[PDB]
Ligand binder design. Sequence first.
Ligand SMILES: Cc1ccccc1CCC(=O)O
Length: 404
Amino acid sequence: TMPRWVPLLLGLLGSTTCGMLLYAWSVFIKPLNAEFGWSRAEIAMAFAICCLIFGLMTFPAGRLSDKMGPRKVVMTGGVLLAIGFILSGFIQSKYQLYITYGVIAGFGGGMIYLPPIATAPKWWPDRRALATGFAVVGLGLGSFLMGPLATYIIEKPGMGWRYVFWYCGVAMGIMALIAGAFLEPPPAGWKPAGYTPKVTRDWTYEEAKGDTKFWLLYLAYFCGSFAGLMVIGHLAGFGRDAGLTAMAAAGAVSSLAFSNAATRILSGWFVDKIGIRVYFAALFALQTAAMIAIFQLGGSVVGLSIVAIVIGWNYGAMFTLFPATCLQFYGPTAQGSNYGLLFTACGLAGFAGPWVGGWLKDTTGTYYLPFLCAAALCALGTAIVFMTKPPEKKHALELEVLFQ
Ligand SMILES: Cc1ccccc1CCC(=O)O
């Protein structure tokens, strides 16, 4: 039936829509402050709520994708996201924005984001991590797609920021319905392949949810996620505090988008070829080193760029290597449920990380505390990821007894 790269194209579409949704809030920081007495932090609360609900709703989304297939889940997510974004177009208050953009749109975003991450590797057992990366690279691309689009709509005279919400919400609803329309696992028996009595079987959601290694991974995820979200918003300010012009710090930090996008594909390909654990742990360790190294490199465009690129490489790689690692531990059958649960760690990190980083800076007045804490979190993640080897594969005695 369908060529097994169509799933990859679909995951590219849906994750790109999710990246657009998660990028929009910065687009509206300044227009909403112009129209209302609304602080940057007041608008950032809408983004933090969005991250909380998105990361949380991956769990029901994965359970439902497993139970009734990914197509219904992704197209419902497209509906919810379209509704919440378009209604953000018609808002008048902060709580209306929190509800429409934060809760509704984030709900739809989690339901769009997860099912392709569980489905694409099913079409690609020879290349599971690369398939996963295609399911997530859209979160690195959504900024580049929306930035010019949202600027274009806002500055046009007959339009406005509410017009960004309305038009971009229709467009994202369409992309997500098109992505979810054509998404389904391979058929129940024959596996698309040219190549390939004890009997193993994949883990069940209840079996993985009870494994201690699942929760070590959850902890590592929370740590790496939290560290990145705590400092990335501070890189450019670190530069200007070091003496760079705002323009120069902004240019340097911008390389983070490129590496954040590239690592999602490239790291998938690498670990498909050489295994996950060692490359994975090395990325966390390098992330630890970068949190420290910024105090020596962050004062020049070249140094700040190196730190930004490295941070982006390690951060973005987490969202391919945690689903790939989970796939290796527990198998693809319950990957929807297993990884949906696991991503809630990111839901929580997304809610709290940026705020806590800002608070540590403003409490001390310096960057030492947030970056030092991020380094410690990444050191812990390094330890966990490096020490944690796959659990024992499961004997399936019910299948096993079928042999006379
Ligand atoms: C880190 C995070 C938290 C909550 C919701 C979304 C995301 C982004 C995930 C990605 O970059 O792939």
